[PDB]
Design a binder for these strands. Structure first.
Lengths: 302, 302
DNA sequence: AGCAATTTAAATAGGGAAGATAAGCAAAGGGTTGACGAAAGCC
DNA sequence: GGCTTTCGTCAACCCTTTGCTTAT
């Protein structure tokens, strides 16, 4: 009794977004996709840090990788492909009598609600992040298996009920609960303005000669595959005292806020996984969380 | 109590101006816009260092970038779009406790007066800097949400009463004290003269083959987006011995003056924000300073 | 069908912001390489 | 009378993890 985790238990990605490519179009003609480019401005500023107050009367010179829309183009086009591969409960590391019993304990999970909020975040354009502020109207074109879907007025933090998101959901939930793959060809149009600053994912640079280093693909401004995939899995409204959706993590970690919303109150992924393999009746909002971390992937052993 | 600021606390800018362009028009016909082309002249000057009195018997040859009005056009047109986005009190980095008991510490702040001085600095033409001097009349055309506004004779230093910079500020203080965005599409007509010198923002150069590199956008003369945004925030008239408006900075620093007005005498932002969070009754003229800094953004941690 | 002039000077200064993190697993094999000396069939 | 094969005897660790100079 008391079935424990395998020492090496890990799961693969079942949501596989590509790197987003940032293009400039207009709101009328969306086919002449001018590619925005990361430029390098060197910016004079002020030294305002919380510790040093005697360094206040000095400037700081920080060269910054910047990405702006061209002044003749008023719409940012964010183009990426999201790949919803199947075989969620199968582990790429470990799994004997644990992954196979987690399969039989996560069999009756609401995958329709799980894959709905997975493609709602795609449809409502949560993957844009800072590209959403100041946008007049965000238009999202999704081209999955020669079917084009268009979304304009979707409120992001409230997962509302519309027909078209529930129609990409029933072809993704069939894969996530089954076997195969479904790829969505996402195209995000937002009317920011002429010359408005677009916001790619900044890169980690250790030493650097640049204060900002923006992600580039052949010099064109781009977003990380992990930044796009972060907002797609921002479906967790099932944590304790839930107000806003958070990204599914094994500890519900929001490191940008510095607070873990799933750790220390017996509601984290590992405790519910142990209860599921040991025989605890998982709640549906917790069963969805456990099978949503298996779609996120990660190492769940140790 | 003494709830400390988080190590990673940061707000984003809620004033997002595009990098300004520079066009050349006439005062009567304001629609035949040409592009102010940044040229490259080579001066022959004097070596006039404070030291080296043994010099200035030799020459000084430097090549600089110059942008001048065409001699058939007597009016410089400076075009940019200011984006006043909302959700000011929500921090991109950090959040919870310190940010949330500062959002509910800055809630009776006079947001009308803040947005009053914010759009009066886009109406008095303070975003033009050295393009202001020598102008006969600086006429500003601000078009927001399909109603244009014209301003021609506003005093730049005195925030005086005007009924049409207050109607714009009503659309801005309904955004800055809430959620959403608004976009002022600003045009700046100044009757400088025929063939006069316009003054774009100068780019920082490290290699420095040139001695003065003006900012260019595909050859067009241009001002930096952080330079236009620097003069929008020049609203701080509530420090010790206030004479002229400076930009709101966390220390009240003017790097071109070498002094910091708010730093040191217990009125800079960090020792005002900490007092507002901890429970000190903030004055109105310092509450607007703190939320003007939150509109400006920056790191406010550690 | 070669000829293209010389000197002279190339800017002084001020700024290059810090705060966070940098995973935990589990594996890492043995198989030959023995010389001296003493039973024990064997020329 | 050696002599040449094969079996029988006798054991027991503590390890360390790049420069040596460096061109007529």
């Amino acid at each position: 009794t008391k079935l424990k985790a395998p020492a090496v238990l890990a799961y693969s990605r079942k949501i596989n977004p590509t790197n987003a490519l940032m293009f400039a179009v207009n709101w009328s003609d969306r086919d002449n996709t001018t590619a925005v480019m990361v430029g390098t401005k060197t910016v004079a500023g002020t030294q305002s840090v919380r510790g040093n107050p005697n360094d206040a009367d000095k400037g700081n010179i920080q060269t910054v990788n910047f990405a702006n829309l061209p002044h003749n183009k008023n719409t940012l086009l964010v183009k990426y492909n999201v790949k919803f591969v199947g075989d969620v409960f199968k582990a790429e590391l470990g799994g004997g009598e644990y992954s196979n019993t987690l399969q039989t304990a996560l069999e009756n999970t609401d995958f329709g609600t799980l894959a709905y909020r997975y493609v709602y975040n795609i449809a409502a354009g949560r993957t844009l992040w800072r590209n959403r502020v100041g946008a007049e109207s965000i238009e999202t074109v999704i081209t999955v298996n020669d079917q084009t879907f268009t979304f304009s007025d979707l409120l992001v933090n409230e997962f509302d009920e519309d027909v078209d998101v529930a129609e990409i959901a029933d072809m993704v939930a069939g894969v996530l609960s089954g076997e195969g793959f479904v790829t969505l060809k996402v195209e995000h149009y937002m009317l920011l303005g002429e010359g408005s600053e677009v916001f790619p994912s900044q890169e980690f640079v250790e030493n650097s000669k640049l204060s900002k280093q923006l992600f580039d693909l052949n010099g064109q401004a781009a977003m990380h595959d992990q930044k796009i995939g972060n907002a797609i899995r921002t479906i967790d409204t099932w944590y304790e005292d839930a107000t806003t959706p958070i990204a599914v993590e094994p500890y519900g970690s929001v490191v940008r806020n510095g607070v873990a919303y799933r750790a220390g109150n017996k509601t984290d992924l590992f405790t519910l996984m142990d209860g599921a393999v040991n025989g605890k009746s998982l709640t549906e909002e917790d069963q969805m969380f456990v099978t949503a971390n298996l779609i996120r992937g990660g190492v769940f052993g140790g």
